[PDB]
Design a protein around this nucleic acid. Sequence first.
DNA 1: TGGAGAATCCCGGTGCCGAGGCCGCTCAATTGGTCGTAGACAGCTCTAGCACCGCTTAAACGCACGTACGCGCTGTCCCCCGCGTTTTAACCGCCAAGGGGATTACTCCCTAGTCTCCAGGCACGTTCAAGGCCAAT
DNA 2: TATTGGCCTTGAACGTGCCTGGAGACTAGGGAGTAATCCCCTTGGCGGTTAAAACGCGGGGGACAGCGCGTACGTGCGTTTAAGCGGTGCTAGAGCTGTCTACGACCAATTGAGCGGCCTCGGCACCGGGATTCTCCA
Lengths: 96, 92, 78, 79, 86, 90, 91, 98, 106
Amino acid sequence: RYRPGTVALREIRRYQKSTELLIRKLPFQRLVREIAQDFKTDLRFQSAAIGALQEASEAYLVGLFEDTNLCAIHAKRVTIMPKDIQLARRIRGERA
Amino acid sequence: PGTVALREIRRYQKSTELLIRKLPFQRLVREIAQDFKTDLRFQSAAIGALQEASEAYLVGLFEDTNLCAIHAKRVTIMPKDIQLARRIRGER
Amino acid sequence: DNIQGITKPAIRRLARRGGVKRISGLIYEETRGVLKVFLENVIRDAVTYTEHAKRKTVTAMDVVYALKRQGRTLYGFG
Amino acid sequence: DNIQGITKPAIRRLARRGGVKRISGLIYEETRGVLKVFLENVIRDAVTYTEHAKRKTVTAMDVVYALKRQGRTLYGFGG
Amino acid sequence: LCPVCGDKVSGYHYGLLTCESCKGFFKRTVQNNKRYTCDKTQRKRCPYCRFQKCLSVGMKLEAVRADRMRGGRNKFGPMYKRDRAL
Amino acid sequence: ESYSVYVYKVLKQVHPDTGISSKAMGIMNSFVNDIFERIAGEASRLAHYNKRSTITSREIQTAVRLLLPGELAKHAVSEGTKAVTKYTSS
Amino acid sequence: ESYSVYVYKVLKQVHPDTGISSKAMGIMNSFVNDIFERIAGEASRLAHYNKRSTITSREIQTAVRLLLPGELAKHAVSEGTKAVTKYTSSK
Amino acid sequence: AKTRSSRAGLQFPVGRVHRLLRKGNYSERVGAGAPVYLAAVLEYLTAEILELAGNAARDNKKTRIIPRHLQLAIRNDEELNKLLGRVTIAQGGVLPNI
Amino acid sequence: KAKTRSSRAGLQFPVGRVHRLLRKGNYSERVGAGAPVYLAAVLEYLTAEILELAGNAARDNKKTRIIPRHLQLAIRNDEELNKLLGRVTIAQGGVLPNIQAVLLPK
DNA sequence: TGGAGAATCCCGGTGCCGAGGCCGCTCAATTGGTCGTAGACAGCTCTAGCACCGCTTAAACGCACGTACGCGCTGTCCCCCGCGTTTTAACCGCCAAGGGGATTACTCCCTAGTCTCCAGGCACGTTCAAGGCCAAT
DNA sequence: TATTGGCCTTGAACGTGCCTGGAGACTAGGGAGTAATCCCCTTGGCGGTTAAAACGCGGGGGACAGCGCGTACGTGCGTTTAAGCGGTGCTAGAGCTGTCTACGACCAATTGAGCGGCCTCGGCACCGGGATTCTCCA
Ligand SMILES: [Zn+2]
């Protein structure tokens, strides 16, 4: 058995060496279509549009997680909590 | 040791006037500008605008620093809070 | 609904790429909310761009222009 | 050495306007450095604008354009 | 003459013709929010009589500025000018 | 060339018994110029995207929808449409 | 229209034995278009500020100085001035 | 009605906006309805900001709008705060919070 | 007899194409004879620098073709290029390997 | 420090799909002459930026002091991590039917361009009522 | 003596002159608006793996609270320091006008550089496979 935290570091090293998308494609397409439903009914999407949206979303989430990690480390912790996300989004200027 | 600080905060948040002496700021502005070009000349309005922009920027930075300090279970701001605020802000 | 398609392991992977070591139990709902807000904004701009052009199909150019409008310029899709 | 003209009471006033209750003793040097970095980046673009049009006097609109270039739009100084 | 006391008027002060004395008295009273306890010769006898007569003749209170902004003209400017046309 | 006359008329329409200072007037002028520049640039980009050589009311409406937030965008679109309809009626 | 031919020529100039992929060319085309738009917009703004109806090498030089970092701006200004002088020398 | 603003029922100059659109290098041609729409939008935004500033100045017993009132009006409104979030106002101060 | 403007200027990027883009882009009423030369030279210089850094990054990983990850590595490892391309995301680029020191085992 | 034992790297084989090198033609880059004005250049008027100087007084600086706050330590209990079974729906391949994007003749209304008339908008100089300051009281 | 008065400073509202830019009218040419056609291209089914999501559950390390202690930061007062407000003197350089030429727009032939389509073969990804090195504990 590996002590808690070794597999986390292994995953961190592994997922920072790759460039593939980390979200399953079909649920993301369904979510995108459901969100777009409220703007105009019976919309069609090119595959490139959904791919670009997915790429942008993953990049944004990775950056937000980096900021959240910095905020959590500031408060003498190792575990990220929602309050760190709120602080990062507040300082960034996203949340009012 | 908390009453005078609160009174100062109230008065300076209601105050809306400038908070830096003008002659030292003018001297600093001219000293910085002398590096890029020689025998430069300035208008009064340019120096006023520079001062006001600097003051607004510093006030905003201090607000963010206070937020970062409060996040860490403290009431005293430290250089680490300023550095974290500028890092997340994206300034380099 | 479809938001549950963004599962716990997916958010875990996204956090792992971000360097996060330990994750709490209430992180995933916050991540879902912020992702919904971001997608809503981008899709709104893209749909407006599509509507102005007298079209019923969303192209990659609309997404790229919408991302550029938010200061999130994206390369590789035209 | 004119940076010391930004005295400690002035920095304290600026912090009080920001809602700060307690201030450490190492804040002042950091604030001075930050102010110098900001002013350098504004003044460089202001002088660059001034060199265009063959002028020897820096105008307010030069600093206004320099600020607007950095996403720090300022109202009340023309333009 | 100034209707509040009976001296020579100096001009348009908080509604109509008054003198410098009554203008000053009104501005001090309004700015200081002064409260006391109760003819030109008797104009200094009691603040109450002069004050109540000033409010009675119709000269107005809101003409005084709470923030004491300087210069310009107040809302009664068009009215003052129309009355001054005569 | 400034917007002082028009801003003053708007203020007289809104608050008939409230004045304005010189510095506030300068701030209002800067605000109007900034908003004009933003909307015009967005309209120009929209016209360039669709390979069009003209800027019409459609591009202005789309730019207003893209820039202003929800209720502001709704009311601005309503006011602009009313103005264009009245002008076209003549 | 694209910049693939010119990008490939520049790549062969700097790295003789080195290829590229299609996605990398797409990214480079986006990069070139972005930089072109930035410089052109800055030059147009500079021309409009000074009340002039022409964009010359001077506006390009000032825009490059405004938009690029120090060493990059210096080298770009040197290269552009050299190119303009070489172009003017011939006729 | 001779002025285009009279036809459009506006208090902003349609002709000046048209001239600025033409001599600004936005497009080769400008439609006849674009200046009207733009002037109406600008007038509405100015009226909104002025109304909020006047209300802020009338809360306190004041009778003249200074930049502090404009800053208070913009900061306390959710829509205008988002619209003008990256704008510095001369002699506006900060919101009396914290 | 006809000579290309790029050959006169000694460039690889096109001068006529840049001139046409400047004319059609609604930037100025007139365009000077030397502006496209300067713009093309600057663009060529920037492209050459990025290509050099990306090629070195690709050679580091024992590859002979440049892929988006090499471009991202070259851009993010250079301070001036990173400052220039600060708000730009590269498709299929990834992130730089970076772990905070505290998170490491004691 | 030594021992299992998972995670990881250094090695060929292989074959497949995309990078990269031709052809033909069309369409955009080049040449050359003519012409109208944008901008270089020189000269003159007058704002305004920069120097000193004296006096008054509010900010800046120094110093003694004591209490509130930061930071280290200890204990305990919640709750996330690592791993081994079940359950599920994401991928992949194929296919077929429209739906909508892209291209092309074509025609007609919309907007640029020029010339003339004259009032809206900017620059001033001048109120002028209201807040401010002073001595005699 | 803390209250009367008299003179002085003040910042948006008003008049006046004049000029440059908006309004009206007319015409020519091209940009935008509709149809008709073509064919990619997007949506929708069906069935067989099988990798990924879901689930159970024991425990170990980390979040969190309590307490003690030392010094750094706040507060007050006497004493320097120099910022702030005038007045005066003296140009450097901004700001506008005039002349006239050098440069860039525009048009018509003319030619060659650069997109599209089509083989093809070499870099790169995938599998064993033993070799070697990270973890963990006892
Ligand atoms: Zn009287």
